[PDB]
C-alpha cells in the first residue's frame, strides 16, 4: 500500500452532510459545502467534494 509515485486508486471521505447510524454504508458522492444550503460539488472552491 505504498507506491513510489503515490497511491491514487484508494479514496477517503473526510466529511459528510448529515450524521450517521450504526452499521451504515453510504454510496453517495454528495458534497460538503460550508454551512447550510449545499453546493453539490464539481471541483471548485469553498465547498468540499
Amino acid at each position, epitope marked *: 500500500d505504498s507506491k513510489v509515485g503515490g497511491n491514487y486508486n484508494y479514496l477517503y471521505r473526510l466529511f459528510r452532510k448529515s450524521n450517521l447510524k450504526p452499521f451504515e454504508r453510504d454510496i453517495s458522492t454528495e458534497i460538503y459545502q460550508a*454551512g447550510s444550503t449545499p*453546493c453539490n460539488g*464539481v471541483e*471548485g*472552491f469553498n465547498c*468540499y*467534494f
Partner: antibody
Amino acid sequence: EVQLVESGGGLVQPGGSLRLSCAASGFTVSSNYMSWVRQAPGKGLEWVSAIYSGDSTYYADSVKGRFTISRHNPKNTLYLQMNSLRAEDTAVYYCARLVGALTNIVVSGDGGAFDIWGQGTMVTVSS
Amino acid sequence: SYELTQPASVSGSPGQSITISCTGTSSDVGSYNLVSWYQQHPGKAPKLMIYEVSKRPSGVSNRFSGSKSGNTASLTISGLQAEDEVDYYCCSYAGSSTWVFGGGTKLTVLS
C-alpha cells in the same frame, strides 16, 4: 507576488489556433479561483469559459464545440487552447477570482466575490 | 446574447441617494439570493463595493447599501462624491448554479 498574469499572445488567422495562458503567482491554481470575463468596451460583458476540472457535465449553451481548454494544477498556470477562433471575438479577457462559502470569510452566507484580476492580453483574429 | 434590463443613465446630486436595479423574471421570486453589485471606472477591470446585499464587505466605506423586495429594487448609493461617476452592474442566478446579470447602469455625478 500573488498575481494573475496573462501570457502567450500572438497573431491568429482564420483557420488557425493559439494557446493562451493565465498563470497565477503566489497562490497555486490547484485550489484557487479562475474566472474568464470577456470584455468589449462600451457594451455588456459575458463570462463564458466553463472549465472546472473533474471533467463532468457543466457547459453553457452558446459555445458548444468551440472553446476547448485543459487543466494543469501543479504548474500554477492554466493554458487556453481556444480552437476555431471567430473573427467576431475582438475582446480582451481577464482571469479573475470569486468567493464561495467554506473558510473564515463565510460561515453563514453565499459568496461570489470576484476580487483579483489579471492584466489581459491583446490577441486579434484578423483575416 | 443573454442580457437583462438595467437603467443605463442614472444621476444624482452629491450627498443624495440613488437606486440601481437589474431585471429578472418570475422564475426568480420564490426563495433564492445572489446579488453582488459592481463598480467600474471605464476602461479597466471592475471594483467590489457591495456584495451580500444587506451585509458587510470587509474593507468598504459603509455609505453604500442595498435593499430587496418583490419587483421593487435598490442598490442604494448614498453620500455621493466626485468619484462615483462610474459604471455599475449586478449579479444574479440563472438556475442550477448558473449565472446572469444586468446591462450596465452608468452613474454621472453632477454639481
